[PDB]
């Protein structure tokens, strides 16, 4: 059931912002590793004396990487005279975030009809304010509220990337593309799922979409294209909860993984794996061949034996709903700490356009992986 | 003249350590961009709860990238019980360095005969101590003194990379190589050259090796293989001193550039330029064709017309001593700030092995570049 109780009009995921120590090196690494174009910049060369911000795009997916300059460069500025292109930015908040959490996601940004309204209604409904609505060049409105930990949910609305960003000069912009097209979901880890759900569902109106080490639940907008899973750990097992491991290494709640939809997960994974050891991303260990011997009995009617064999060479996981089928794979952590990672996903089914969440999120793969592991010991 | 006044026995440049916010992403970017292998690691997977350190190598060139974990992971440790593989490391010093300077070089490390002795003699001769001699696994001794700004000169000596580092698993270690072989020199920028020279020459015994915006001087070890240029700005010009621009953006003195010797600067630059826009390094703008039309009259006896044309397609600079000839080129800044950059260099002449500094450091290229610029306006 979908009660469609959004308290404001939400469109789609708009971008994800990483707070970095050096935005240049993270952005260049992510560009090569994921096949994302350099699309826009805001830095010293555009008059920004506050922060260096670089935007990567792939289809509708937008990754923003931001780091602070020396405060001395903008010491004479005040907020009314700021050269920062993102007015919520703050040297102290950014340095504190990164020193506390390491590299990771500061902002999950969704495009809304009216960011000022979305902010007001959110706050009137319990949201903790983080940065008030600010109108940029009479064209774009941006506002922020707290989501969990030091992660903010950012509202952006357009009358018509951001004012103050310049499009990147073609020579600097190499048209890489490995098939990734949009953000499918963004998953938070928190110490207690209950109050996190109540808080976020409280101020958005998002509805519940619906051995492990976790409990979770998914909040979703009216059309279920903005999907916001939240995990909590389950304590006292045999293998320690990776949710609890995250909270310890991350110094508290934060974003656990971004799942990126590919229009062709086989080409994406071929392209990403060729680059794993030459600056790109590493993938988690492949499941045993028992896992793939068991795929015929589960998805033999959705995927041919050749497509199943192709999942096997690439290390791809498969799970299935009552409504659809899902291909997924997981990278190793994106940075030094065992915290944030990326998932590549592709959904087959639920044609009407494709409805969101088609096939679920792979929860069946926990049981399926364990049961392939001990039966591969054989 | 070379008075050979080293106060302790110095062998060679041993490594360069970058202090980072996230060591993983900087190291992976540098690996792809410069063609350096992943060679060794010390992090959580090796029992290091203090810092993440990754070593890249190319020939004798060793780049170390280090970032701090959350202090909470090692809160119960004391220095006698530390899991850090580099005992001089300190969370607070590292966070402070990076937040003040951004990405850059913390340590210029030279291999010496006896790091304890080198430390004692250095300190007895005016060096400001930074980290005392520490013996690692009865095998390697490491010690540090202040060089300029927050950069340390690090002494390492071996009885026989470091204890506690593990060699990197072959699958993770892709044998990239674009021809770079060793560190040729490491250049500091300071506000006042005089006291910096006197200080460093004071405690090492290093001798002076011998429009711009700078004044400089080069300190060198007995065999002139450790070359340590230092710049100061020249104030009140027309173009503002790039040395002064460095000090402002770097928040004070620091390392300006590392010059990396290539055994084949043409292949290196071909390989580096193919990767500039796909995660690698950008190069400064090429000199005008007038610069290359003037190369025949200057180096026509060292380089053929085809080799000169090859310098022209790649953007390579050429200068010449009385003793030798030098090919050089400069990258754009390595990170967000207009501070540290890299130089690729290759020397022809001075055969005895090649003597250090053969051909100089390209000081003639300042005059030659200006004079090609206005004559290219033509
Ligand atoms: C160690 C890294 C892999 S992991 O822990 C993992 C597995 C498996 F690998 F266990 F199969 C299967 C599915 C997911 C996932 O994306 N869940 C998820 N997303 N959104 C919701 C809601 O729920 C996942 F994170
Ligand atoms: C804007 C970046 C290029 S720059 O300022 C530059 C040029 C030129 F580009 F002006 F020719 C020529 C030579 C050098 C150099 O390496 N000097 C240098 N090394 N060691 C010593 C001593 O002295 C240099 F840094
Ligand atoms: Co997921
Ligand atoms: Co140089």
UniProtKB/Swiss-Prot annotation, chains A, B:
Its cofactor is Fe cation. Pathway: Amino-acid degradation; L-phenylalanine degradation; acetoacetate and fumarate from L-phenylalanine: step 3/6; Cofactor biosynthesis; prenylquinone biosynthesis. It comes from the Eukaryota. GO terms for cellular component: cytoplasm. This is 4-hydroxyphenylpyruvate dioxygenase. The keyword Nuclease does not apply. GO terms for molecular function: 4-hydroxyphenylpyruvate dioxygenase activity; identical protein binding; iron ion binding. Homodimer. Catalyzes the conversion of 4-hydroxyphenylpyruvic acid to homogentisic acid, one of the steps in tyrosine catabolism. Residues 12-158, 182-332 form the VOC domain. The keyword Oxidoreductase applies. Keywords: Cytoplasm, Dioxygenase, Iron, Metal-binding, Oxidoreductase, Phenylalanine catabolism, Repeat, Tyrosine catabolism. InterPro entries: 4OHPhenylPyrv_dOase, 4OHPhenylPyrv_dOase_C, 4OHPhenylPyrv_dOase_N, Glyas_Bleomycin-R_OHBP_Dase, Glyas_Fos-R_dOase_dom, VOC. It catalyses: 3-(4-hydroxyphenyl)pyruvate + O2 = homogentisate + CO2. Its EC number is 1.13.11.27. It is found in: Cytoplasm. GO terms for biological process: L-phenylalanine catabolic process; tyrosine catabolic process. It is an enzyme of class 1 (oxidoreductase). It holds the Pfam family Glyoxalase. Belongs to the 4HPPD family. Fe cation binds at residues 185, 257, 343. The gene is HPD. Binds 1 Fe cation per subunit.
């Amino acid at each position: 059931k979908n009660p469609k109780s959004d308290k404001f009009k939400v469109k789609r995921f708009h971008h994800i912002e990483f707070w970095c120590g050096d935005a240049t090196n993270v952005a260049r690494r992510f560009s090569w590793g994921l096949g994302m174009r350099f699309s826009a910049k805001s830095d010293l060369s555009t008059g920004n004396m506050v922060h260096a911000s670089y935007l990567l795009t792939s289809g509708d997916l937008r990754f923003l990487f931001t780091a602070p300059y020396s405060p001395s460069l903008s010491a004479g500025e005040i907020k009314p005279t700021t050269t920062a292109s993102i007015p919520s930015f703050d040297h102290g908040s950014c340095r504190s975030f990164f020193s506390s959490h390491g590299l990771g996601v500061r902002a999950v940004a969704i495009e809304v009809e009216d960011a000022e309204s979305a902010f007001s209604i959110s706050v009137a409904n319990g949201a903790i304010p983080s940065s008030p609505p600010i109108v940029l060049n009479e064209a774009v409105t941006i506002a922020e509220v707290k989501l969990y930990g030091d992660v903010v949910l950012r509202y952006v609305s357009y009358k018509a990337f951001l004012p103050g960003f310049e499009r990147v000069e073609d020579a600097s912009s190499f048209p890489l593309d490995y098939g990734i097209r949009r953000l499918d979901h963004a998953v938070g880890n928190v110490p207690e799922l209950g109050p996190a759900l109540t808080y976020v569902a409280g101020f958005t109106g998002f509805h519940q979409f619906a051995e492990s080490g976790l409990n979770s639940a998914v909040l979703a907008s009216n059309d279920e294209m903005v999907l916001l899973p939240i995990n909590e750990p389950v304590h006292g097992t045999k293998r320690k909860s990776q949710i609890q491991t995250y909270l310890e290494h991350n110094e508290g709640a934060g974003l656990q993984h971004l799942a990126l939809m590919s229009e062709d997960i086989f080409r994406t994974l071929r392209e990403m794996r060729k680059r794993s050891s030459i600056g790109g991303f590493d993938f988690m260990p492949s499941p045993p061949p028992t896992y793939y011997q068991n795929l015929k009995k589960r998805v033999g009617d959705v995927l041919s034996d050749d497509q199943i064999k192709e999942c096997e060479e690439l290390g791809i996981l498969v799970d299935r709903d009552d409504q659809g089928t899902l291909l997924q794979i997981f990278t190793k952590p994106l940075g030094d700490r065992p915290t944030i990672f990326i998932e590549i996903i592709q959904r087959v089914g639920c044609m009407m356009y494709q409805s969101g969440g088609c096939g679920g999120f792979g929860k069946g793969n926990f049981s399926e992986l364990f049961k392939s592991i001990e039966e591969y010991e054989k």
